[PDB]
Each structure stands twice: as C-alpha cells, then as structure tokens.
C-alpha cells in the first residue's frame, strides 16, 4: 500500500518534472498585506488573492539581482522541484508568473511561523511532542528520497507550523535530484552530516543525520553540536561523540545513536531495510503513520490566529523588460 502510493507518486512527479506548469496569474490579482521576510535578491509577502479571498505567501525575486549573483539555474531548478512535488508536509506552489522586473512564486500561506520561533518561545518539547513532528519529517523524507531528491536544508527555521499545528516544509534552496553522490558544502553547520564536512561524496543519508539533529534539538531545547566557530562545530560532528541529557529515554538515545551514526553505511535510513529501520524503532512504537499522513492526530500546539516584523516596500516594476531571455523557462 505504501509501495503502491509511492509508485503512483513517482509517476505523478515525473510527468510534472518532464513537462513543467504553464505561467499563471498576474500581480494585480493579489492585494499586498505585509512583508513576512527579506533576502539579498528578494522578499516574501503575505498576499490576498482578490477573487477567491485566499491568503498566500508570495516570493518576489529581482531578476537583475538573480542574474548578478549567478543564481539563474538555482532559481529554475528550485521552481521545477516545487511545481512537481505533492505531499501534505510540503508547501504547495499555487501560482508562478513574471513581469519586466520580477519573478513571482505564490505559495500556500503557513500562518503559525517557524519551529525555530516556537522553540525560542516554549523551550524543549516532551518526547511525545518531539515524536509528532519527527514522524512528519520521516514521511516527508521517505517521499522525497523515493523521487531521488536530497533535501539537505533541514533546520528549525525551515519548518513552518500550519493552522492544524502540522509541519509545512519550505526552502527548497539546496534540494537536488541526484542518483549517487554529490559534494557541495551547503546547509547550516549545526545540521551537517560528517560526510558533507569531509571531502568525500554524500547521498540521501545526510537527510537522516539531519533528522537526528532535529529530534535531539526538539527534545533537549538545544542542538547536539554547537560552538562559536563553524570549524569547532565540524570537529565535534566528525568526532562521533554526543552527550544526551539525563531525561532522554533509552529508546530516544538508541534511535539518536543510530541516526547520528558517523559511518553513513551504518546509519538508520540508509540500510537495506531503508526507512523501515526508523519507522519500526521502539521510539516510534506508538506512532500511527497513516493517521499522521492524514493529519488526524491532534497537534501539541495550535497557533493563535508568529512572524518577526519587517519594514514595508512597494513593488516597483520597470517599463522595460529585464533579463527576458535568461528566464524564458521560468
Ligand atoms: C504510511 N502510509 C501512507 N499512506 C497513508 C494511507 N494511504 C496510503 C499512503 C504513506 C504515504 C507516505 N508514507 C506513508 N506511510
């Protein structure tokens, strides 16, 4: 049944992967409300789609700046991945379009903010609460890896909490469709697997290491490897020593020791049994996997009807088309 679901999901993905979506919608169809985040070559705004009244998060990217920072192909690959994937815990890309100045990606609005912010506000989660969130990541990585996608950007900041208290994964900035090995040093230091830091190639197993870090951080209220200098963080990561808080259950420690396995060939999620070594672990014994997928489990936290404040700026669109041919495939 899981095998049957994933086989169908692979077919669905490849159809969209090989034949991308047509350009939909225009700027004036959305009322601009508030800036939700800013970056070097773009910003994300809370918008209301006028005709439906639906609220969305619109990513506005400055074309000239994308071209300047050599981010053309990165932008296109990221869009291509977003429009092709379909899973409950991945943010829906609703519309994409472009004008003379900007590229626009209109995504599902996730109102409850980042898990980072939730951790900053409430501290460590109980093991049952950590397990609720962990279960959604497991199923998400199961789905993504079945499509040969490595995520390689798991961190609390990239996990947004929806009105039902469920995770919506944003930021496909480092996501890569790869069969076999790759080498790029990308991602936040705290969450990097030893094989990313070291000169050797890596595969999808890096996502499972990152899951180990996330579960540790949720249950402890701090990351397993931290220091002021990234090099010092790396030294701790490669060394293979983790200190577990005294309140960590035996089941939690065993799962974490197997996820935070320095030898990628011995790491849970990367053995012959695959995801089942994680899903069937004693720590996940109480987890109803179907119920999590269907979002039928009551969440630990429902956001109040969450984001940090940013200064507002109007969308300026030039009367002359910028970088037209460069973004033809967008
Ligand atoms: C267990 N069950 C799953 N379902 C929910 C019930 N209908 C079939 C698909 C999925 C989907 C991804 N991973 C899963 N693990």
Same domain, residue pair 94 and 168: no
Closest CA to 106 of 92, 120, 116: 92
Same domain, residue pair 200 and 138: yes
- Phi/psi for 329 (5° steps) reads -85, -5
| Cα–Cα distance, 63 to 174 (Å, whole number) | 19
- How close is the Cα of 299 to the center of ligand 1, in Å? 19
CATH number of the domain to which 42 belongs: 3.30.200.20
293 lines ligand 1 (CB under 6 A): yes
Same domain, residue pair 229 and 268: yes
Q: How far is CA 308 from CA 36, 53, 113, 312, in A?
A: 7, 24, 9, 13
- Phi/psi for 154 (5° steps) reads -75, 125
Distance of alpha carbon 46 from the chain centroid: 19
139 lines ligand 1 (CB under 6 A): yes
Q: Which of 12, 28, 148, 153 is catalytic?
A: 153
Same domain, residue pair 36 and 160: no
289 lines ligand 1 (CB under 6 A): yes
Same domain, residue pair 74 and 144: no
Domain count, the chain: 2
- How close is the Cα of 54 to the center of ligand 1, in Å? 28
Same domain, residue pair 51 and 100: yes
Same domain, residue pair 9 and 27: no
86 lines ligand 1 (CB under 6 A): no
153 in active site:
yes
H/E segment holding residue 238: helix 230-239
> Considering only CA atoms, which residue is closest to atom 4 of ligand 1?
290
DSSP H helices, 22-86, are: 63-68, 72-84
User: Exposure pattern of 184-223 as b/e (b: 16+ CB <10 Å)?
Assistant: eeebbbbbbbbbbbbeeebbbbbbbbbbbbbbbbbbbeeb
- How close is the Cα of 291 to the center of ligand 1, in Å? 9
* Spatial contact of 115 and 43, defined as CB atoms under 8 Å apart: no
| Cα–Cα distance, 113 to 7 (Å, whole number) | 33
Same domain, residue pair 46 and 99: yes
* Spatial contact of 205 and 193, defined as CB atoms under 8 Å apart: yes
**Half-sphere exposure of residue 175, counting CA atoms within 13 Å on the CB side?**
24
* Spatial contact of 116 and 157, defined as CB atoms under 8 Å apart: yes
| Cα–Cα distance, 250 to 285 (Å, whole number) | 13
Helix orientation angle between 127-146 and 205-220, rounded to the nearest 10 degrees:
170
Same domain, residue pair 26 and 76: yes
Q: β-pairing, 30-38 with 55-62?
A: unpaired
Same domain, residue pair 28 and 165: no
Note down the domain range covering 325. Answer: 20-113+305-329
Give me the residues paired with residue 210 across strands.
none
Q: How far is CA 281 from CA 125, 126, 256, 270, 273, in A?
A: 20, 18, 11, 14, 12
Q: How far is CA 279 from CA 151, 266, 289, in A?
A: 19, 16, 8
7 lines ligand 1 (CB under 6 A): no
- How close is the Cα of 9 to the center of ligand 1, in Å? 11
Same domain, residue pair 158 and 181: yes
Ligand 1 atom closest to Cα of residue 293: 5
Same domain, residue pair 119 and 256: yes
Give me the residues paired with residue 303 across strands.
none
CATH number of the domain to which 163 belongs: 1.10.510.10
User: Exposure pattern of 257-283 as b/e (b: 16+ CB <10 Å)?
Assistant: ebbbbbebeebbbbbeeebebbbebeb
Closest CA to 15 of 80, 84, 93: 84
């Amino acid at each position: 049944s899981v095998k049957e679901f994933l086989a169908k999901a692979k077919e669905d993905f490849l159809k969209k992967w090989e034949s991308p979506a047509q350009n939909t919608a225009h700027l004036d169809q959305f009322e601009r409300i508030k800036t939700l985040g800013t970056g070097s070559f773009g910003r994300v705004m809370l918008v209301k789609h006028k005709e439906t009244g639906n609220h969305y998060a619109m990513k506005i990217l400055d074309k000239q700046k994308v071209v300047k920072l050599k981010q053309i192909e990165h932008t296109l690959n990221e869009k291509r991945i977003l429009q092709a994937v379909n899973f409950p815990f991945l943010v829906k890309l609703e519309f994409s379009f472009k004008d003379n100045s900007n590229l626009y990606m209109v995504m599902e609005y996730v109102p409850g903010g980042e898990m980072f912010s939730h951790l900053r506000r409430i501290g460590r989660f109980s093991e049952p609460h950590a397990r609720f969130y962990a279960a959604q990541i497991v199923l998400t990585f199961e789905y993504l890896h079945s499509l040969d996608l490595i995520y390689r950007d798991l961190k609390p900041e990239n996990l947004l909490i929806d009105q039902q208290g469920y995770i919506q994964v944003t930021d496909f900035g480092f996501a890569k469709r790869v069969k076999g090995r790759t080498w790029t040093l990308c991602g936040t230091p705290e969450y990097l697997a030893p094989e990313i830091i070291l000169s050797k190639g890596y595969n999808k197993a890096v996502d499972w290491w990152a899951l180990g870090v996330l579960i540790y951080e949720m249950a402890a209220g701090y990351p397993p490897f931290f220091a002021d200098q990234p090099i010092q963080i790396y030294e701790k990561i490669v060394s293979g020593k983790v200190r577990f808080p005294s309140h960590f259950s035996s089941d939690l420690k065993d799962l974490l020791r197997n996820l935070l396995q320095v030898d990628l060939t011995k790491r849970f999620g990367n053995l012959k049994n695959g995801v089942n070594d994680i899903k069937n672990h004693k720590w996940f014994a109480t987890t109803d996997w179907i119920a999590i997928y269907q979002r039928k489990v009551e969440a630990p936290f429902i956001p109040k009807f969450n984001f940090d404040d940013y200064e507002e700026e109007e969308i300026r669109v030039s009367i002359n088309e910028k970088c037209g041919k460069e973004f033809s495939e967008f």
